[PDB]
Design a protein around this ligand. Structure first.
Ligand code: HEM
Ligand code: HEM
Ligand code: HEM
Ligand code: HEM
Ligand SMILES: [Zn+2]
Ligand SMILES: [Zn+2]
Lengths: 102, 102, 100, 102
């Protein structure tokens, strides 16, 4: 694996596995991180995955510095842009590969 | 495919295709960009792939800004650090995947 | 100056100076790279500057690899994502500075 | 303000502000982040700022993931290469500009 994927996995385990363990979605059926769901929901481009991660979507909190208002955003520390870039890259790679173990 | 692999492919097709088209090595045997040869030669980490690309190695010219001496380095445009970073990522990932078309 | 500014300037002097010398606009009045024009045209943020540079806007050619269609895009080589990032950074910096 | 300076400010306010608030230096005289001191100490290029941040210097710990030896490096969380790049950019810019606000 590459350094970017390794870092992506580390960030994912820190920030995302509460709701998306093994690529799933414990809150919203049909909105997993697998390719078919990403496509159905219009979040299949890496750019859109970044946007969803930064700003949030529906009941998902955004993680970006400038996510707003605070109720739409993570209770925890905001992630840096580069971290969100790596997370979007990780989700795109994982979806392309059918979610190999992280 | 991720954006990073697309970006790396663009760079690879410009800078590396002279000797390493399709992951091979036209100059000498046993030094392709396939896993077995990277492992054989001890150039199997992104850090080392970066180093070889930056500074050169034997009959391979270096592409880094501070590649020296001149004789060991490309006489074309030198690549930026981020470009070589992308190239190291590209080679590592492509080696892992057995060099599929991008 | 920083490495990013230096690289941004190098890229600008190759790809942009023809139409935007000293932050101006040789084709379109009211659409210079100065702060007030950028704001008036809704190209206020660095993210929007990147979008415009990548995809183009009318007689402004797009420089990104996926700019489309061809007639909307530079006739020269497409610029890399990182290059367009540096260009948006350069233009934002220069606009903030008032193009000295 | 550019995105990069904002990203650098965020990192600075987490890792550096405790000793270098306002571009100063609380530990010892004559080693602030102002141009005059950077030039005097030979830490005036962006590359040298990066190196000092990564590896440390005198009483300053290094923050790089691969900083050595152990005693010259932070015992707290280490920074990623991209974070140190943004920090070096931030310091170089702020020094060039005479440490204006934000
Ligand atoms: C961790 C930083 C994190 C990432 C990365 C992430 C990504 C992500 C994507 C790409 C989607 C779109 C899925 C689709 O099929 O359309 C998505 C959607 C939802 N998420 Fe998420 N998500 C991360 C973090 C979290 C956390 C910690 C939670 C739980 C609190 C969470 C929840 C959700 C929910 C709900 C959705 C569905 C949104 C909708 O379309 O209604 N996410 N996430
Ligand atoms: C393009 C910038 C480029 C990259 C990237 C690249 C990578 C690379 C690697 C990772 C190796 C190690 C391979 C191994 O099995 O050990 C490697 C090695 C050699 N290369 Fe290369 N290389 C790039 C560019 C070029 C070009 C343009 C040439 C031809 C002039 C070239 C040639 C070689 C040679 C020879 C080696 C073997 C070096 C040695 O072990 O002595 N490379 N390259
Ligand atoms: C070089 C890569 C380049 C950059 C960078 C760039 C930027 C840019 C911006 C940010 C705008 C918006 C300005 C505003 O006030 O709204 C803008 C607009 C126009 N440009 Fe441009 N541009 C670059 C390259 C070029 C080149 C080479 C030309 C000339 C062929 C050109 C022209 C124009 C035109 C016309 C506009 C106005 C678009 C509109 O609002 O109708 N640009 N550019
Ligand atoms: C935050 C990660 C951080 C940065 C960035 C940073 C930079 C930095 C530079 C560029 C210098 C050179 C200054 C000069 O005038 O030559 C420098 C020097 C020192 N610093 Fe630093 N530094 C960061 C973090 C910290 C922290 C958290 C402390 C306090 C524990 C600290 C202290 C020092 C000291 C002491 C020096 C002087 C080194 C020397 O020349 O002997 N730094 N720093
Ligand atoms: Zn990557
Ligand atoms: Zn920058």
């Amino acid at each position: 694996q590459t350094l970017d994927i390794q870092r992506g996995a580390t960030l994912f385990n820190r920030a995302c596995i509460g709701c998306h363990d093994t690529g799933g979605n414990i809150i919203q059926p049909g909105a997993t991180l697998f390719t078919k769901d990403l496509e159905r929901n219009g979040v299949d481009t890496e750019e859109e995955i970044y946007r969803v991660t930064y700003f949030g979507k529906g009941r998902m909190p955004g993680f970006g510095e400038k996510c707003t208002p605070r109720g739409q955003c993570t209770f925890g520390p905001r992630l840096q842009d580069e971290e969100i870039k790596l997370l979007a890259e990780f989700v795109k790679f994982q979806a392309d590969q059918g979610w190999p173990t992280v």
